[PDB]
Design a protein around this ligand. Sequence first.
Ligand SMILES: Nc1nc2c(ncn2[C@@H]2O[C@H](COP(=O)(O)OP(=O)(O)O)[C@@H](O)[C@H]2O)c(=O)[nH]1
Ligand SMILES: [Mg+2]
Length: 323
Amino acid sequence: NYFKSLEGEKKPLNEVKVLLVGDGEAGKTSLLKRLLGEGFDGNEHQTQGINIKKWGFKDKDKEIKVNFWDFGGQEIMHATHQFFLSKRSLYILVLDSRRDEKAEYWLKHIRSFGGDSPVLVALNKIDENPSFELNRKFLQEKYPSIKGFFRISCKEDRGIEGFSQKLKKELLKVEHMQIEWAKSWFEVKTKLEKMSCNFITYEEYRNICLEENVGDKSSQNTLVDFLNDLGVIVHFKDISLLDTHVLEPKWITEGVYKIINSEILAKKKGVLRFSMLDEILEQKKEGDYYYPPERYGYIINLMKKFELCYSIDEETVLLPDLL
Ligand SMILES: Nc1nc2c(ncn2[C@@H]2O[C@H](COP(=O)(O)OP(=O)(O)O)[C@@H](O)[C@H]2O)c(=O)[nH]1
Ligand SMILES: [Mg+2]
């Protein structure tokens, strides 16, 4: 073994996170069903919360793997979807007529988080409003990330075939599709995927890496950046956030919603003292997620980061909506 255990054979990654974004009741969940060939029944508004569907297709030899992220009505309303928007990904912006010109709002939003990630704009519900159009030449020039506009109808199944062909084509052209990994990096990845924990500390991640061939920090830090962008974990490089490596996205959101929908916080005009978090994040019943006291800082600072929270002093924070 010692003689031939220095280098390693490198397979291609071929994975991308696809983020369905846009206003609530626009067509995101419906469009996702059409891409996977699940049809349309009219009752897809009943499906809410974080839904991650794993999809794949074979282009020639290459086995392409896709991770669709679908954000529910609570996610867009409370803006908790911001936690999962990442670079080196692909974005699908779903729009509709009823909300007049909200596209440029979303394009600036995707630009700030997505970076160089390509965007495909879907003009949904043309059966309800045929005349619905956008100034395409203006938008694609101002936002080079836009690769195409598509008038579609998830109800009548119009324009999905054309949209799906462009999606497949642009998915192959993403920058990190050509990038290739060592065998150990895939073993770390697949280990994390099969784990059922809510999160892991940065010590535990380094141990999992040690277990596998990669033991040097430089390589370990490059791997989490990928794993974050691929959607295997949810990780941030801020000093107050970097310890928590979230494996279950619902752990974060349900913790934030408990704070936002706290009846004790409703009174007091939304002033959140950190002594109150014990009662709010306590395990009541029926599979409530466990929130350790050491992760109180994570949740609060995470909410502060994306402007769901504003600091009054060092021990308290404000919720403007409850004021
Ligand atoms: N007529 C029509 N209805 C649609 C179309 N797409 C979605 N809908 C319906 O309008 C609502 C949109 O919600 P939906 O796409 O399921 O969830 P969300 O976009 O992720 O918030 C649902 O009741 C869908 O059945 C469409 O293209 N045409
Ligand atoms: Mg939805």
